[PDB]
């Protein structure tokens, strides 16, 4: 692996994950993208160097490091238009950040419109030399990590505003129905030992069922999350969700499918769809002949702790904070609505705004989008399920913060006293009321949005606009990033 100081070359490129092939997004001329991986307290250093010609694509990008804080380097989070410009074609941006007290499973992708649909999206790694689940395993390393991902025959901006994936891809590889002779991805384990497997969704739309043909799985990180060890049976991730799961390799030598049901496109698995491959040393070289049983132990999100057992910030009652807030979805135009408001791209980042001397919720665009959040304060955040909303269960996402989920989806009980704690939550489906909670440690405009990619381009986004009066003093921003927009702005409009 690479990192955590790192060029990230960014250009187009042929590729074919399914065994058809297309136009995508190359990074240092690979795809899929480069595992990155660094230590728990490391400084990262990722200088993307942005040589796209696409403009289909989008010839700028810009890019987010999904999972980590970032306290005080708000401008490296990534989102176009909230935290910073594009960069531009024929320019480099260096994301100078560090992480100390974070260590576990993140993902890097695209934040500007969809374009990581097209590619632009990958797996980070980040080990605690001290990591508390750390005896429960032999391996784990750039081959333990497991990505699922959505592929698309035409690119994002080519085919429906809405598509449906023709493959869904385990490592890069898998098939399409008009490719049952593509590669599958294999994943090799040797008997009798333990593995740390990585599950990374880089998803921009299904979510998958996850599971091993004859092996059991004990989950032990959610969203870079430590969590009480919880075995299970398989797991239905979202995208943009990670866990980390114990395989012990204790079964007959021999060949199993690794499954992964989409939720849309092609369900089911006739001749290898969705699928990839557990293979023992010593097995023959041939595709697993195994089965599934419906099994039970499911994970369920109400039923994951946090290995410290931590509370819910606020009190244990509905409304126990300082501020309460409920997002109402809804669907006006071809458009997505919270509470009323449909959020597209402002012309100034929402980051520069503020630096640039806006100081309320109210002065920042886009209207109607963006929430001021007070310093120091335990918030408390519902986003009831309705089908007013197309295209739910929609899994939401808080940049900038962890946050307790007080109840998941498809559960009525509410957890103050030892909830989960992940960054990317289902909002489930209709009579559901995920709620979710976090303290304001951490000043700075935090995009919180559905990490279904094609939902986030059609408007359903806010802006939690986090301590607006310290964030000048909290994020000093580099040269390199005031320049950003200057650049931008002078482009043509298909050089963008
Ligand atoms: C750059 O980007 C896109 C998408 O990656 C390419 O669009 C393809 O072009 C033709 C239309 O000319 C189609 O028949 C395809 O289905 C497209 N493929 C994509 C995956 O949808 C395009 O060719 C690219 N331009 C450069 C010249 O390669
Ligand atoms: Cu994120
Ligand atoms: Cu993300
Ligand atoms: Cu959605
Ligand atoms: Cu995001």
Redesign the pocket.
């Known amino acids: 692996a690479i990192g955590p100081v790192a060029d990230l070359t960014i250009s ?1 490129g042929a590729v074919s994950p399914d065994g058809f092939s ?3 997004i190359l990074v240092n001329d690979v795809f899929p993208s480069p595992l990155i991986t660094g230590n728990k307290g490391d400084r990262f250093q990722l200088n993307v160097i942005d040589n796209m010609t ?1 403009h ?2 989008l010839k700028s990008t810009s890019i987010h490091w999904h999972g980590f804080f970032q306290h005080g380097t708000n401008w490296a989070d990534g989102p176009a238009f909230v935290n910073q410009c594009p960069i531009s074609t024929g320019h480099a941006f260096l994301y100078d950040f560090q992480v100390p007290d974070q260590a576990g499973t993140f993902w890097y992708h695209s934040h500007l419109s969809t374009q990581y649909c ?1 590619g632009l999206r990958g797996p980070i790694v980040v080990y605690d030399p001290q990591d508390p689940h750390k005896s429960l395993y032999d391996v784990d390393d750039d081959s333990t990590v497991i990505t699922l991902a959505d592929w698309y ?3 994002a ?3 429906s505003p809405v598509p449906t994936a023709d493959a869904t891809l385990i490592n890069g590889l898998g098939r399409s129905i008009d490719t049952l002779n593509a590669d599958l991805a294999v994943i090799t384990v040797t008997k009798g030992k333990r593995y740390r497997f990585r599950l990374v969704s880089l998803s921009c739309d299904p979510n998958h069922v996850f599971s091993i043909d004859g092996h059991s799985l004990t989950v032990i990180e959610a969203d870079s999350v430590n969590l009480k060890p919880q075995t299970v049976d398989s797991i239905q991730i979202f995208a943009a969700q990670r866990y980390s799961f114990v395989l012990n390799a204790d079964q007959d030598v021999g060949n199993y499918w690794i499954r992964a049901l989409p939720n849309s496109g092609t369900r089911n698995f006739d001749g290898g769809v969705n699928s990839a491959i557990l293979r023992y040393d010593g097995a023959a070289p041939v595709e697993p002949t195994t089965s599934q049983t419906p099994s039970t132990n499911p994970l369920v999100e109400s039923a994951l702790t946090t290995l410290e057992g931590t509370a819910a910030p606020g009190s244990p009652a509905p409304g126990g904070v300082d501020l309460a807030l409920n997002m109402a979805f809804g669907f006006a135009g071809g458009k997505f609505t919270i509470n009323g408001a449909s959020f597209t791209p402002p012309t100034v980042p929402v980051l520069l705004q503020i630096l640039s001397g806006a100081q309320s919720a109210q002065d920042l665009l886009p209207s109607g989008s963006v929430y001021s959040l007070p310093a120091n304060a335990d918030i408390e955040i519902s986003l009831p399920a309705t089908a007013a909303a197309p295209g739910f269960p929609h899994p939401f996402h808080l940049h900038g913060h962890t946050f307790a989920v007080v109840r998941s989806a498809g559960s009525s009980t509410y957890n103050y006293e030892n909830p989960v704690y992940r960054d990317v939550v289902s909002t489930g489906s209709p009579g559901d009321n995920v709620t979710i909670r976090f303290r304001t440690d951490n000043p700075g405009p935090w995009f919180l949005h559905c990490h279904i990619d094609f939902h986030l381009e059609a408007g359903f986004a806010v802006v939690m606009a986090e301590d607006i009066p310290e964030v000048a003093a909290t994020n000093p921003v580099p040269q390199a990033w005031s320049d950003l927009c200057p650049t931008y702005d002078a482009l043509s409009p298909d050089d963008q």
């Open positions: 187009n297309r136009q995508a696409n289909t694509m097209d025959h035409l690119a901006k080519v085919g």
